Design an enzyme around this catalytic site. Sequence first.
Site, PDB file in Angstrom:
ATOM      1  N   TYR A  14      87.705  53.899 -70.370  1.00 31.95           N
ATOM      2  CA  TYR A  14      88.448  52.649 -70.361  1.00 31.95           C
ATOM      3  C   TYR A  14      87.488  51.451 -70.264  1.00 31.95           C
ATOM      4  CZ  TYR A  14      93.306  54.277 -70.299  1.00 31.95           C
ATOM      5  OH  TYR A  14      94.546  54.768 -70.635  1.00 31.95           O
TER       6      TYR A  14
ATOM      7  N   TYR B  46     101.255  61.665 -69.586  1.00 35.43           N
ATOM      8  CA  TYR B  46     100.386  60.516 -69.305  1.00 35.43           C
ATOM      9  C   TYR B  46     101.122  59.199 -69.122  1.00 35.43           C
ATOM     10  CZ  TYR B  46      96.925  63.882 -71.109  1.00 35.43           C
ATOM     11  OH  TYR B  46      96.159  65.014 -71.351  1.00 35.43           O
TER      12      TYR B  46
ATOM     13  N   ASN C 281      80.062  56.153 -76.989  1.00 37.39           N
ATOM     14  CA  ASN C 281      80.397  57.550 -77.228  1.00 37.39           C
ATOM     15  C   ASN C 281      80.399  57.935 -78.698  1.00 37.39           C
ATOM     16  OD1 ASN C 281      80.406  58.010 -74.535  1.00 37.39           O
ATOM     17  ND2 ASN C 281      82.648  57.911 -74.294  1.00 37.39           N
TER      18      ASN C 281
ATOM     19  N   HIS D 171     101.369  71.964 -73.540  1.00 36.58           N
ATOM     20  CA  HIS D 171     100.369  71.358 -72.648  1.00 36.58           C
ATOM     21  C   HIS D 171      99.709  72.387 -71.723  1.00 36.58           C
ATOM     22  CE1 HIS D 171      99.534  67.197 -70.629  1.00 36.58           C
ATOM     23  NE2 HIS D 171      98.507  68.003 -70.429  1.00 36.58           N
TER      24      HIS D 171
ATOM     25  N   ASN E  13      95.240  74.825 -72.462  1.00 34.87           N
ATOM     26  CA  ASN E  13      95.101  75.570 -71.201  1.00 34.87           C
ATOM     27  C   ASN E  13      95.492  77.046 -71.278  1.00 34.87           C
ATOM     28  OD1 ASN E  13      94.042  73.384 -69.502  1.00 34.87           O
ATOM     29  ND2 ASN E  13      96.021  72.417 -69.935  1.00 34.87           N
TER      30      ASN E  13
ATOM     31  N   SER F 130      85.144  65.270 -66.118  1.00 35.10           N
ATOM     32  CA  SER F 130      86.440  64.856 -65.575  1.00 35.10           C
ATOM     33  C   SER F 130      86.410  63.503 -64.868  1.00 35.10           C
ATOM     34  CB  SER F 130      87.022  65.924 -64.621  1.00 35.10           C
ATOM     35  OG  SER F 130      86.678  65.694 -63.258  1.00 35.10           O
TER      36      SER F 130
ATOM     37  N   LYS G 156     101.750  66.192 -76.383  1.00 38.54           N
ATOM     38  CA  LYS G 156     101.870  67.479 -75.748  1.00 38.54           C
ATOM     39  C   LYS G 156     103.227  67.634 -75.074  1.00 38.54           C
ATOM     40  CE  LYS G 156      96.948  67.229 -74.592  1.00 38.54           C
ATOM     41  NZ  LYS G 156      96.798  65.801 -74.194  1.00 38.54           N
TER      42      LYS G 156
ATOM     43  N   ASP H 216      94.164  61.272 -78.187  1.00 37.66           N
ATOM     44  CA  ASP H 216      94.821  62.341 -77.438  1.00 37.66           C
ATOM     45  C   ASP H 216      95.714  61.762 -76.346  1.00 37.66           C
ATOM     46  OD1 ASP H 216      94.693  65.456 -76.896  1.00 37.66           O
ATOM     47  OD2 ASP H 216      94.576  64.464 -74.929  1.00 37.66           O
TER      48      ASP H 216
ATOM     49  N   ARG I  47      82.170  52.334 -76.999  1.00 38.62           N
ATOM     50  CA  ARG I  47      81.291  52.126 -78.139  1.00 38.62           C
ATOM     51  C   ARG I  47      80.090  53.063 -78.116  1.00 38.62           C
ATOM     52  NH1 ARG I  47      82.754  47.728 -81.015  1.00 38.62           N
ATOM     53  NH2 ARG I  47      83.989  46.098 -79.967  1.00 38.62           N
TER      54      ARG I  47
HETATM   55  N1  LIG Z   1      95.150  69.348 -71.904  1.00 36.66           N
HETATM   56  C1  LIG Z   1      94.933  69.051 -70.621  1.00 36.66           C
HETATM   57  O1  LIG Z   1      95.459  69.703 -69.714  1.00 36.66           O
HETATM   58  C2  LIG Z   1      94.044  67.986 -70.342  1.00 36.66           C
HETATM   59  C3  LIG Z   1      93.466  67.872 -69.079  1.00 36.66           C
HETATM   60  C4  LIG Z   1      92.582  66.824 -68.785  1.00 36.66           C
HETATM   61  C5  LIG Z   1      92.251  65.902 -69.785  1.00 36.66           C
HETATM   62  N2  LIG Z   1      92.823  66.012 -71.061  1.00 36.66           N
HETATM   63  C6  LIG Z   1      92.524  65.043 -72.150  1.00 36.66           C
HETATM   64  O2  LIG Z   1      91.098  64.940 -72.242  1.00 36.66           O
HETATM   65  C7  LIG Z   1      90.698  63.575 -72.030  1.00 36.66           C
HETATM   66  C8  LIG Z   1      89.314  63.418 -71.440  1.00 36.66           C
HETATM   67  O3  LIG Z   1      89.152  64.222 -70.255  1.00 36.66           O
HETATM   68  P1  LIG Z   1      89.052  63.529 -68.839  1.00 36.66           P
HETATM   69  O4  LIG Z   1      90.135  62.573 -68.639  1.00 36.66           O
HETATM   70  O5  LIG Z   1      88.922  64.626 -67.868  1.00 36.66           O
HETATM   71  O6  LIG Z   1      87.710  62.617 -68.860  1.00 36.66           O
HETATM   72  P2  LIG Z   1      86.197  62.825 -69.481  1.00 36.66           P
HETATM   73  O7  LIG Z   1      86.298  62.688 -70.952  1.00 36.66           O
HETATM   74  O8  LIG Z   1      85.589  64.042 -68.874  1.00 36.66           O
HETATM   75  O9  LIG Z   1      85.524  61.515 -68.877  1.00 36.66           O
HETATM   76  C9  LIG Z   1      85.252  61.467 -67.483  1.00 36.66           C
HETATM   77  C10 LIG Z   1      84.736  60.050 -67.164  1.00 36.66           C
HETATM   78  O10 LIG Z   1      83.583  59.819 -67.973  1.00 36.66           O
HETATM   79  C11 LIG Z   1      83.395  58.389 -67.977  1.00 36.66           C
HETATM   80  N3  LIG Z   1      82.631  58.096 -69.202  1.00 36.66           N
HETATM   81  C12 LIG Z   1      83.052  58.082 -70.478  1.00 36.66           C
HETATM   82  N4  LIG Z   1      82.020  57.802 -71.282  1.00 36.66           N
HETATM   83  C13 LIG Z   1      80.943  57.627 -70.505  1.00 36.66           C
HETATM   84  C14 LIG Z   1      79.660  57.318 -70.794  1.00 36.66           C
HETATM   85  N5  LIG Z   1      79.307  57.137 -72.082  1.00 36.66           N
HETATM   86  N6  LIG Z   1      78.740  57.204 -69.825  1.00 36.66           N
HETATM   87  C15 LIG Z   1      79.118  57.409 -68.492  1.00 36.66           C
HETATM   88  N7  LIG Z   1      80.449  57.723 -68.207  1.00 36.66           N
HETATM   89  C16 LIG Z   1      81.329  57.820 -69.225  1.00 36.66           C
HETATM   90  C17 LIG Z   1      84.815  57.788 -67.988  1.00 36.66           C
HETATM   91  O11 LIG Z   1      84.843  56.659 -67.099  1.00 36.66           O
HETATM   92  P3  LIG Z   1      85.129  55.186 -67.639  1.00 36.66           P
HETATM   93  O12 LIG Z   1      86.538  55.211 -68.073  1.00 36.66           O
HETATM   94  O13 LIG Z   1      84.828  54.356 -66.442  1.00 36.66           O
HETATM   95  O14 LIG Z   1      84.159  55.008 -68.748  1.00 36.66           O
HETATM   96  C18 LIG Z   1      85.736  58.938 -67.560  1.00 36.66           C
HETATM   97  O15 LIG Z   1      86.581  58.569 -66.448  1.00 36.66           O
HETATM   98  C19 LIG Z   1      91.857  62.973 -71.164  1.00 36.66           C
HETATM   99  O16 LIG Z   1      91.919  61.523 -71.125  1.00 36.66           O
HETATM  100  C20 LIG Z   1      93.039  63.635 -71.855  1.00 36.66           C
HETATM  101  O17 LIG Z   1      93.345  62.919 -73.078  1.00 36.66           O
HETATM  102  C21 LIG Z   1      93.706  67.053 -71.315  1.00 36.66           C
HETATM  103  C1  LIG Z   2      96.192  69.338 -63.901  1.00 38.69           C
HETATM  104  O1  LIG Z   2      97.315  70.196 -64.204  1.00 38.69           O
HETATM  105  C2  LIG Z   2      98.579  69.882 -63.801  1.00 38.69           C
HETATM  106  C3  LIG Z   2      99.034  68.602 -63.467  1.00 38.69           C
HETATM  107  C4  LIG Z   2     100.359  68.409 -63.067  1.00 38.69           C
HETATM  108  C5  LIG Z   2     100.752  67.112 -62.749  1.00 38.69           C
HETATM  109  N1  LIG Z   2     101.566  67.115 -61.524  1.00 38.69           N
HETATM  110  C6  LIG Z   2     101.238  69.504 -63.003  1.00 38.69           C
HETATM  111  C7  LIG Z   2     100.783  70.782 -63.338  1.00 38.69           C
HETATM  112 CL1  LIG Z   2     101.788  72.159 -63.286  1.00 38.69          CL
HETATM  113  C8  LIG Z   2      99.468  70.954 -63.734  1.00 38.69           C
HETATM  114  O2  LIG Z   2      99.051  72.225 -64.051  1.00 38.69           O
HETATM  115  C9  LIG Z   2      99.065  72.596 -65.445  1.00 38.69           C
HETATM  116  C10 LIG Z   2      97.756  73.282 -65.826  1.00 38.69           C
HETATM  117  O3  LIG Z   2      97.677  73.956 -66.859  1.00 38.69           O
HETATM  118  N2  LIG Z   2      96.757  73.087 -64.936  1.00 38.69           N
HETATM  119  C11 LIG Z   2      95.403  73.668 -65.146  1.00 38.69           C
HETATM  120  C12 LIG Z   2      94.739  72.991 -66.342  1.00 38.69           C
HETATM  121  C13 LIG Z   2      95.442  75.186 -65.324  1.00 38.69           C
HETATM  122  C14 LIG Z   2      94.546  73.392 -63.916  1.00 38.69           C
END
Ligand SMILES: NC(=O)c1ccc[n+]([C@@H]2O[C@H](COP(=O)([O-])OP(=O)(O)OC[C@H]3O[C@@H](n4cnc5c(N)ncnc54)[C@H](OP(=O)(O)O)[C@@H]3O)[C@@H](O)[C@H]2O)c1
Ligand SMILES: COc1cc(CN)cc(Cl)c1OCC(=O)NC(C)(C)C
Length: 316
Positions: A267, A50, A275, A112, A162, A216, A79, A45, A273
């Site tokens: 990261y 990003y 997960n 997005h 979202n 998160s 996205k 993803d 590994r």
């Molecule tokens: N569509 C959107 O608006 C949107 C918004 C947010 C995120 N996303 C996508 O969703 C992905 C994941 O969400 P997220 O970034 O919020 O993070 P997450 O998946 O909720 O992970 C949060 C933290 O968990 C830690 N972690 C991972 N595996 C672990 C484990 N097995 N044991 C303990 N800790 C662990 C990681 O730290 P370490 O790196 O130190 O392991 C990471 O920083 C993003 O990278 C992105 O691709 C999309």
């Molecule tokens: C985390 O969401 C956003 C991150 C940036 C980066 N500057 C800009 C915007 Cl507008 C963002 O909001 C988009 C969005 O859908 N945010 C939610 C997921 C509703 C909290």
Amino acid sequence: QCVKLNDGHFMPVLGFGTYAPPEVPRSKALEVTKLAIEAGFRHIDSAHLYNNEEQVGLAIRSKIADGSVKREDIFYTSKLWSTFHRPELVRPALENSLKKAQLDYVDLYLIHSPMSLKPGEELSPTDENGKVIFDIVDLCTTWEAMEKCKDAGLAKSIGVSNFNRRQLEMILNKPGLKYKPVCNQVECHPYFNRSKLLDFCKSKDIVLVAYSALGSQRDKRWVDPNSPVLLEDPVLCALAKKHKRTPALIALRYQLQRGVVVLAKSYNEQRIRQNVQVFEFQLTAEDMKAIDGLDRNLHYFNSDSFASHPNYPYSD
Ligand SMILES: NC(=O)c1ccc[n+]([C@@H]2O[C@H](COP(=O)([O-])OP(=O)(O)OC[C@H]3O[C@@H](n4cnc5c(N)ncnc54)[C@H](OP(=O)(O)O)[C@@H]3O)[C@@H](O)[C@H]2O)c1
Ligand SMILES: COc1cc(CN)cc(Cl)c1OCC(=O)NC(C)(C)C
């Protein structure tokens, strides 16, 4: 280990999250995406936002080049950023993402966010008070442009991210709709489990994809540090002890058992590994009910910069 999307394509149910904050070198996204593929992740993803598509694309191409995977084995998502909602900007945005990743197509392209932003200026235009500057765009026109991207073969599948139920309904009810969104990628974890939105998505054969499934990254720009730390939750910890797993693995497995496709960012080589072990155990009905009991309407992304936007999804 895939779900069939409503357009006939298949999406792996565990995805690797590639976002890391600016203080992490761009460099690392290459290393860790390679490790993710090595560990067994097949869904990756990313997003324009990003600033890592070159690195993530290179990791994919490297694992193709050394014979570990074929392109058809990888499910890559990008996205459309919110400054590109105007329909004439959609395909160029996608073409740019493809050029950065050096891929012929994405498996999935998402809107997005429903929160449109002023075009033709900065990445995230903000006013004097730090509120993002909105634009008024009919997202059904944005969707039509997304459909054209699918018809052109630039994206195998198209979806959203979202969106709340009403925002999805706006697309689903559009006159002349050609393709439903295959998914809605949303914040989803045991403190914000989205059960009613999930039910609606299930009713329309739209996949809910969970981000922040592990609580998160608690980025100081958007997340209150007072918020409960998901992976320190006492119920998740008790379940981890019961199953001799980890709170993270409990949180991921929860989503799979509710029919949610789940992302996990790490990261760290060991956690990457770890997960993939989500496929190695299961939770009982009572375990699932215990986790369902944790719901507390907690969206970790909770900022003044977004909350006044006219299409902020958490208004509903
Ligand atoms: N569509 C959107 O608006 C949107 C918004 C947010 C995120 N996303 C996508 O969703 C992905 C994941 O969400 P997220 O970034 O919020 O993070 P997450 O998946 O909720 O992970 C949060 C933290 O968990 C830690 N972690 C991972 N595996 C672990 C484990 N097995 N044991 C303990 N800790 C662990 C990681 O730290 P370490 O790196 O130190 O392991 C990471 O920083 C993003 O990278 C992105 O691709 C999309
Ligand atoms: C985390 O969401 C956003 C991150 C940036 C980066 N500057 C800009 C915007 Cl507008 C963002 O909001 C988009 C969005 O859908 N945010 C939610 C997921 C509703 C909290």
